Amino acid sequence: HIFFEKAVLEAPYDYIASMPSKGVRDQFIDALNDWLRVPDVKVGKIKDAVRVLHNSSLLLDDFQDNSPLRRGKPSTHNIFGSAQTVNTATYSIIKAIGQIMEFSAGESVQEVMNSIMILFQGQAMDLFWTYNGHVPSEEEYYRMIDQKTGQLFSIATSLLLNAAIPRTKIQSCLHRLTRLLGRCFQIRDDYQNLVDLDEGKWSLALIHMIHKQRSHMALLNVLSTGRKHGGMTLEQKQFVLDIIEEEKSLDYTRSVMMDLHVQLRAEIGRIEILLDSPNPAMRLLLELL
Amino acid sequence: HIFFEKAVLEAPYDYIASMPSKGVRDQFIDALNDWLRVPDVKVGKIKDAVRVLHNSSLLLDDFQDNSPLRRGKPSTHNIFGSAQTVNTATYSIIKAIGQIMEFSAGESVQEVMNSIMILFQGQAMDLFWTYNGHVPSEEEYYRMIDQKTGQLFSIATSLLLNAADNEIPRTKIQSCLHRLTRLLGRCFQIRDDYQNLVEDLDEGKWSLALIHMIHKQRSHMALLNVLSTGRKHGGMTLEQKQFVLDIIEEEKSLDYTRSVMMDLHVQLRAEIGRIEILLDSPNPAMRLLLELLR
Amino acid sequence: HIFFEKAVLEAPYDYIASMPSKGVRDQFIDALNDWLRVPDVKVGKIKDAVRVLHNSSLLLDDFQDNSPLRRGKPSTHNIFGSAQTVNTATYSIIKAIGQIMEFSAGESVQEVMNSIMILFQGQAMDLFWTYNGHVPSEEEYYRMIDQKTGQLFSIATSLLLNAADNEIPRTKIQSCLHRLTRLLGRCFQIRDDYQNLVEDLDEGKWSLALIHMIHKQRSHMALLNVLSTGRKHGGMTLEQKQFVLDIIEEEKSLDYTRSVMMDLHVQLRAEIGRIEILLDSPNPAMRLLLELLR
Amino acid sequence: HIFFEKAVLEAPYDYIASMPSKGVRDQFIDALNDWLRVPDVKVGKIKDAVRVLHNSSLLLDDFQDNSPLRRGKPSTHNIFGSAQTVNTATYSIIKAIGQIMEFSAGESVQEVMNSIMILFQGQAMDLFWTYNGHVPSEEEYYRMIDQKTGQLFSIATSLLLNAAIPRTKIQSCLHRLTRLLGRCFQIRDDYQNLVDLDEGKWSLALIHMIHKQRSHMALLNVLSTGRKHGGMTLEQKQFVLDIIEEEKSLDYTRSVMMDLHVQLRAEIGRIEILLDSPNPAMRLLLELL
Prior knowledge:
Chain A has one domain (about 1-290). Helix content of chain A is about 65%, strand content about 0%. Chain A has 15 helices and 2 strands. In chain A, strand 1 (about 70) and strand 2 (about 75) form a beta hairpin. Chain A is globular. Chains B, C: This is Fusicoccadiene synthase.
């Protein structure tokens, strides 16, 4: 009937939903709801909207990096074919927009529309630097990371500032905290995924090493010419392993995390002092990293 | 520099922005404008957004059906890779959705996006059939063709009408126009099909001819089993493809779509004459659009 | 010398003539003899012909499902090649049909072959489903299982009864016996299935479990799409196979066949008690046959 | 319904039937009906029975020699898979037996049952000599050929002698003509198929050359060791081509045909003189070769 055509379109989403999600986009909102304090009948709807947007982000990601198994279960790219996964991810983002064009928000449609166009620009960069071997710089890797991960919490917050009653004075001093939390969470996720293979999959633990001016040019010319001629040899695979240990990129991630925290605990304090009410939970949210 | 990011993202959509489309969406919009009588500023922004949706559908369709040379240049999938064109298409769809929002919000645009998710339910039906091999019926196949090809004309008309003049009959012509759009989209899909079989796409997709043959009790088993061996071996043969061409030549397949195209053509002709009697004047453009369908 | 031709033809069937079958057709025939009370010359020729049909079905089945090690030796397909085992199987089927003709022709044997062509309509249904991927229903799946596994027991019983004693109730027990055969064959197929899932055959075939899952609206799409990708890539994975095992563990699949096996077991038990009241004495062998079904 | 399960089993047969059959098994019976003169309501049934038996023979053959295209259209082995073609060929022979267990014949069931067991023995030999490289001898190749082709006309005639009224005096002097016509027709078919590739596909035009004691041992050792090590080289493929020309196997087929004819025209004469009625058609049947 109609339920058939409706449950076949939403089948890949129904497969990615049953995954044991970390529950951060649904906890950051629960921690941001301590300050903004929107009604439950609305915060739940916004949580649903950011949840479908993020699950569709995973749907596009798990295909945009060919991986038979993402975590525990097999990857949607490897179960429903590839054409089905793409044609359901696109429908899912449009459905989330229509969910945002509703009670989620009325007049600031351009606000979330632009904050989604940023989310796709910050991803095209990753696909470009992987498909074209064009190694980045930290001034651009941090740009991309904040252009692809933080642009989800940005929509998550820009819709909670459209419902929550002071003024937008917090905005300029609230977005900052959003982008900071987003970058730190991506960095923590990369760290846990590391503790390696290349094949066009950059990270902080690689943009710090491939720019270490000691043995830098050896690196900028080891990946290439080998990634063309097959993939890599066997002593070369150990070479970069021992190279990452040299300057200890794995410790620059620790240092940047030790700076994102002390940047968070001074950025949360801005909100804690703007509104005269502590937040015994958002300070505990930092246990994520 | 954003000047570079904003041009690596748009790069795929720019690659088929200049392809020789020989499209008809433009002619249909310039023919509906003969009735709606909207300012040229409007008929410009509408074409400059429905063309984005169309080219985005091309990226999204001409990639699942991995093709080679298209008009002298290879398919956008093989050049920019699969992962990059998908991201550019998902962005370009949102770019057009944002373009729509700007021109108008009165009379609601929550029914202009609810008319795009239908354009993806249709493609979802098609990509579920071609993948899981489930043969369609005849009514279900017509439903998918209406959902997938005609829905883009439906978006264009539902955006045109929403800023038509604020005069005119308004709603008293809306449902009639929507029926005209459905029949016109169905004809323009079925005509490209009948031109393809004058076949060559037996690698997975489902034309109306295939729906005619697989449903006739004579040789129904044979054709069903041929498609299964094809999808099992990834392409049938140059010999088995000649067998399917001979089934088409046997069951009078090129005579059953013609008897459907020539029927939908007279139906569209009756529909257009019904539009010229609903507080409207002649449209020698629409009757020149039907001539572009053999 | 014919001594060589007559031994290269019989060579494949002789290769599984000594395989450790652990079969049950013999036990069932020796249990039906407890009722029919036929001369041992009969109960010998019957087993020496229904065993030929069974081993021939093995050649014909264990070849389409190209397998490797079977009981410590490879499948008869890989040793003698596909073309040679098929010819030996088609000959051995006719050898058993000719064997049947000899023992008896009164009461007609034109209904003993009409009960073998059913055993091939069943296998034809199975080889059309596994090939063209058409999912079965539940009643159609039970029909195929009755046609394919139970029909060999039906041949044995319709040959036993046709020379049962010329005394006995005769026809007044024929239809009851035929219902007993159908239920017993269905149980012995479903039990081998439930033992296979304590799975490992997701390369094309269709167990009852697969018919339970693909029919439940929850995750019906997921499982259908997994089987399509499997049959498209020729085998799914070691990862996707674990996904199907987790669906089985989720939808309570190993609890729905058990609720069907334990139902068919009580049904068979009631049927056997109904046979002991139809001018017959106890059969402590039949009630020891049911114990060989967990 | 029931028509479904009935038309799926008989679908491969329905595909091999639409082929443009030569129409020999339905013409040999029409030419044998001149002497025996059975009723039409019976000769048609026997023609149907031998037609399904022969179409099932083709079904097993076209799979037992892997060929994507037999003639004009594609091969049943390459359309319905392989498991379907086998499981319909077997059903077709059983159905033909049941058609023979009827009006076709009543009491002489063993006659046609044995004449079908011979038809499968005469084929197992071919599959053995192909699957095992065991080159035959003419004393065995003629045996196999008469054991595989003539055993169809044999059933075609043994059922017309079960309906047709003299005695079985003709039998012993009628079977001979059947087997002679069967061998000559197979030889004519092989000749037309030749006027080559090996891969275990013997013929008269090969059993005559691979036994030509001049260059014989070179042949018995050229095929093997090469058919294992890949297939063949490029000068070797021309070698046997020029070898067949040497002794002219292609002319021993002509000589054996020039003997089968003069053997036929003296075997048909036996029937022509036994019953005092000429046959202006069976003499014209010989135009097949």
